[PDB]
């Protein structure tokens, strides 16, 4: 999540991020319910207050909310104990925010995002861009190994495909932000823009990337002014699932058919319907490719035709159950590397070694009756050294 | 009033 | 028309088998219970000094589900319990009316006695003739206003008109709310009905005098723990947890000042506002009451203040606020 991302940042970058007022408002908005009040309280105050007082302002009931919000803001480093005054920059910058100091767009965003997904799968008709190709490949969801040949999709790439467009886009931006620092792009500049969007050379490159994903659109030959799309700030289903492992996809887009074809066999193609059968051969292939069963049920669940919505569960339980069993069937044998110790002549010392292995956290399985245990090879030397020491 | 058994009523799959 | 400010109304509900039938969306018995809760909750909200008592008549027997009281929460609780009632038997109107008459016979003259019978099964098996009872009711000045369900039964037809009440039938569930909602208002007092002054006392809420000095510990008066402060009485000197409750000792009604002020809007009903669709020289595009643009060809005005009120404002003013905003000035 967005708040998750801010927490995983250094104090130096955070204070830099708390620049123009719009950022402080953006970070303020995500304060869950309580801390928003606390921010307003100690906003006009220039003198730190005791930590005990904050604790006693929340009734015993719903006390857990008092601590969790406090921990969240401590992570955000909004205030400091100073022994709980807010950051002088945040207080000042926030005070600036607090009285101080269309239909075409959505279609464009949906289409431009789709072509990226088209490229993700082996779709010959997809947008081609060297920067985009290396972006996805370096994003951890694609791999080429040969610049001349088009890249394939990694194990995580297939899972990314099934995720809903909101989470599908957000995960991509989250990966984009992390790699921005590695490639030499300042994280604060891009991160600050995203917040300001919700309402320089680095931005110009960043804006071009955002234009490529379809989140932003200048419409005026790349003018200074841009018009963000709906997805930039941050739909009815079409699949009918039958009890006999049949999917009737009411799809006109080639991408959705490509998605459904990942984990099912396509039988017939009609302009507003495609007949797909969820055969165990396909699903096992989909699971082998990297997909997780929960995603398949979720992917079919979210794109559920309205007719199935009235039924509960919308997906017939046997289909959902059967898909899971197909997943669990593959992993019947849980392979786990380890080192086995037998011929435990020292029965008394076997327990001592057992206790030592447990303390180190290396032991995986043990059998007291047979006086044997298995330890991962990583810790094999440690136990081997312990045995040699005697 | 003679409700269905647990196994038939709700899924028994671990997942 | 002078109304009965204080009224003692009994909501007699039939536990007949016909209530089992589902002509409406939910079970008929549940629906009446669900909606009767609205009337009970709303009944006191628009007449505090009044008191209500529910009766359920099933299997030819009329059992007092709840006695006369002033706490809507207690009555509503019984309604929730009655949802799972067996609802198997045949009602007896004579039994129901007789039960109400006994309790209402001893009521003070000033109060306006009433009864509301929710009739569901057209059949009425009774131990004795009801026409003798009907004569007694008129001498007892009890207003019985039946609300039939899916039947214009003759027996009830004479009952309402002969006894002075009003008879109605449920055209549909939505119409059902209108019928009961009408009975919420204090029915006008007829020529036969009389009025008299009623004694009452206003219980001043009291708490610990000065840091638990000369404190007044006590638990309640109808697992209540000790209470630092609570309503007292001019005469009982008894700790009453909540108001308005009749003195368990004096027999004198205890009621706070706001409750009496709640019913004044009945005395001074607001004159309806003439509806003129065209602008009619009204140069204010925004409604005066709500300062919102009028997107409809509709306007309302008073006879004194002569202000402009949209449909939303007029619907609100005559529904809840019971007063004209601007015309107050």
């Amino acid at each position: 999540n967005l708040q998750e991302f801010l927490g995983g940042l250094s104090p130096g970058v955070l204070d830099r991020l708390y620049g123009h007022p719009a950022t402080c408002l953006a970070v303020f908005r995500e304060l869950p319910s309580l801390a928003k009040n606390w921010v307003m309280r100690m906003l006009f105050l220039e003198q730190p207050l005791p930590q005990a007082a904050v604790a006693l302002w929340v009734k015993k009931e719903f006390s857990k909310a008092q601590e969790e919000s406090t921990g969240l803001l401590s992570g955000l480093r909004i205030w400091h104990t100073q022994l709980l005054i807010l950051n002088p920059i945040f207080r000042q910058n926030l005070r600036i925010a607090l009285l101080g100091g269309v239909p075409s767009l959505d279609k464009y965003a949906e289409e431009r995002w789709e072509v990226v997904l088209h490229f993700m799968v082996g779709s010959p008709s997809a947008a081609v861009s060297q920067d985009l190709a290396q972006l996805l490949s370096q994003a951890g969801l694609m791999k080429s190994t040969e610049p001349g040949e088009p890249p394939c999709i990694t194990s995580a790439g297939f899972q990314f495909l099934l995720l809903d467009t909101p989470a599908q886009l957000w995960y991509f931006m989250l990966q984009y932000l992390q790699t921005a620092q590695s490639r030499g792009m300042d994280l604060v500049e891009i991160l600050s823009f995203l917040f300001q969007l919700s309402f320089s050379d680095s931005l110009l490159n960043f804006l071009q990337h955002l234009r490529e994903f379809g989140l932003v659109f200048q419409r005026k030959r790349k003018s200074r002014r841009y018009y963000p799309t709906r997805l930039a700030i941050n739909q009815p289903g079409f699949i009918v699932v039958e009890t006999n492992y049949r999917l009737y996809a009411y799809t006109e887009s080639e991408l959705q058919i490509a998605l459904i074809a990942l984990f099912s066999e396509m039988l017939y193609r009609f302009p507003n319907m495609v007949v797909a059968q969820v055969t165990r051969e396909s699903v096992q292939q989909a699971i082998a490719s990297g997909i997780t069963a929960q995603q398949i049920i979720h992917f079919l669940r979210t794109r559920a035709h309205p007719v199935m919505l009235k039924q509960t569960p919308v997906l017939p339980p046997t289909i959902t159950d059967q898909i899971r069993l197909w997943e669990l069937e593959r992993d019947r044998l849980r392979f786990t590397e380890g080192v086995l110790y037998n011929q435990f002549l020292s029965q008394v010392d076997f327990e001592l070694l057992l206790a030592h292995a447990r303390e180190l956290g290396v032991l995986v399985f043990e059998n007291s009756a047979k006086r044997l245990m298995v330890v991962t090879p990583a810790g094999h030397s440690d136990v081997k050294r312990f045995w040699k020491r005697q | 009033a003679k409700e269905r058994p647990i196994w038939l009523r709700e899924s028994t799959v671990q997942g | 028309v002078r109304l009965g400010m204080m009224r003692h109304l009994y909501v007699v509900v039939d536990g007949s088998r016909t209530m089992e039938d589902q002509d409406l969306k939910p079970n008929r018995l549940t629906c009446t219970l669900k909606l009767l809760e609205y009337f009970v909750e709303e009944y006191f909200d628009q007449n505090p000094i009044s008191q209500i008592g529910i009766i359920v008549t099933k299997s030819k027997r009329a059992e007092k589900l709840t006695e006369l009281s002033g706490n809507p929460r207690k009555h509503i609780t019984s309604l929730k319990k009655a949802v799972d009632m067996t609802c198997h038997g045949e009602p007896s109107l004579y039994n129901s009316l007789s039960i109400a008459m006994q309790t209402l016979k001893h009521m003070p003259g000033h109060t306006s006695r009433e009864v509301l019978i929710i009739f569901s099964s057209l059949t009425t098996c009774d131990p004795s003739n009801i026409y003798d009872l009907i004569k007694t009711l008129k001498a007892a000045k009890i207003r019985v206003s039946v609300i039939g369900l899916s039947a214009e039964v003759r027996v009830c037809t004479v009952l309402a008109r002969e006894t002075g009440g009003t008879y109605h039938v449920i055209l549909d569930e939505s119409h059902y709310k209108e019928l009961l909602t009408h009975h919420v208002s204090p029915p006008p007092a007829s020529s036969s009905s009389e009025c008299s002054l009623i004694r009452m006392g206003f219980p001043q809420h009291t708490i610990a005098s000065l840091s638990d000095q000369d404190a007044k510990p006590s638990f309640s008066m109808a697992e209540p723990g000790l209470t630092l402060g609570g309503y007292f009485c001019p005469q009982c000197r008894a700790k009453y947890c909540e108001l308005p409750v009749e003195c368990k000792i004096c027999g004198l009604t205890l009621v706070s000042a706001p409750h009496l002020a709640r019913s004044y809007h009945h005395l001074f009903p607001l004159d309806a506002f003439q509806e003129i669709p065209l602008e009619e020289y009204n140069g204010e595009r925004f409604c005066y009451g709500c300062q919102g643009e009028l997107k409809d060809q509709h306007v309302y005005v008073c006879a004194v203040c002569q202000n402009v009120f949209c449909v939303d404002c007029d619907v609100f003013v005559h529904d809840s606020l019971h007063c004209c905003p601007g015309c107050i000035h």
């Binding site: 006693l56 | - | 400010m5 009623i198 006392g201 206003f202 005469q235 706001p258 002020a261 300062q291 609100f316």
Partner: protein
């Protein structure tokens, strides 16, 4: 979401007396505190909406239905409309010696219907929790008790809070209102520090007010007085027509003209 409504009592006579007194507290600061209080509320979340209402001896008018200073653009518009609107109302006004007491029930009546007008407009998906942050600044009017009493009940029926924040005089009638509807009450004695009371006591919404420690409710004296005298009476006599608290036994109560029969 929440629909806050700041029914400010901008009484020129009282606020003007402060100007003549040349006290530190002044109306301009009060509107700023309301302004900052208003900005913070919307600032909490996008879905929130607010409204501001003034009061005067004549009539009460709504004060509310790029980023030059750098603040949020939306808040910029609210400040402009409120700043200009209040000045017009204060500067322009007639004179009526007979009527000099501030009116608040009328202003509230404009507030209660606004939520209902706004409650209809809001879509079925989103449930709204409206509130009225009445900020009284002058004594109540005797003739307005009945009118004010009807609006309060309308609020309770529709579940709108009245968080009275009276100052410089404890309004016995207003403190009654906040109790009936579940609203908060507060008699701030440090008028210059008025805003900090607002951000603490009044700013948090109802869904969050419960999970918070706030000043305990003040005792409300539900006094009842006879219509002869206007003196507190503990045992009152009323008739089933007037429903009028009366001093002592009379053969017939004057307001009724009923042919009361002895017994």
């Amino acid at each position: 979401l929440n629909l806050l409504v700041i029914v400010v009592d901008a009484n020129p006579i009282w606020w003007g007396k402060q100007a003549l007194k040349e006290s530190q507290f002044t109306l301009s600061k009060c509107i700023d505190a309301v302004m900052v209080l208003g900005n913070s509320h919307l600032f909490m979340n996008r879905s929130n909406k607010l409204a501001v209402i003034a009061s005067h001896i004549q009539e009460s008018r709504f004060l509310y239905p790029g980023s030059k200073d750098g603040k949020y653009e939306l808040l910029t518009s609210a400040n402009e409309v409120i700043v200009e609107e209040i000045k017009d109302l204060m500067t322009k006004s007639d004179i009526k010696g007979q009527h000099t007491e501030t009116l608040l029930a009328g202003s509230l009546a404009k507030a209660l219907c606004y939520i209902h007008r706004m409650n209809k407009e809001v879509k079925d998906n989103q449930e709204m929790k409206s509130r009225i942050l009445v900020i009284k600044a002058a004594e109540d009017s005797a003739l307005q008790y009945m009118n004010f009493m009807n609006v309060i009940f309308a609020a309770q029926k529709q579940n709108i809070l009245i968080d009275a924040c009276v100052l410089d005089s404890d309004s016995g009638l207003l403190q009654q209102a906040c109790d009936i509807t579940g609203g908060l009450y507060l008699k701030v004695p440090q008028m210059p520090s008025l805003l900090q009371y607002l951000l603490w006591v009044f700013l948090p919404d109802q869904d969050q007010r419960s999970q918070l420690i706030l000043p305990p409710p003040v005792h409300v004296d539900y006094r009842a007085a006879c219509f002869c005298h206007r003196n507190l009476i503990e045992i009152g006599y009323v008739c089933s027509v007037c429903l009028s608290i009366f001093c002592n036994f009379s053969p017939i109560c004057t307001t009724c003209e009923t042919a009361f029969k002895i017994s």
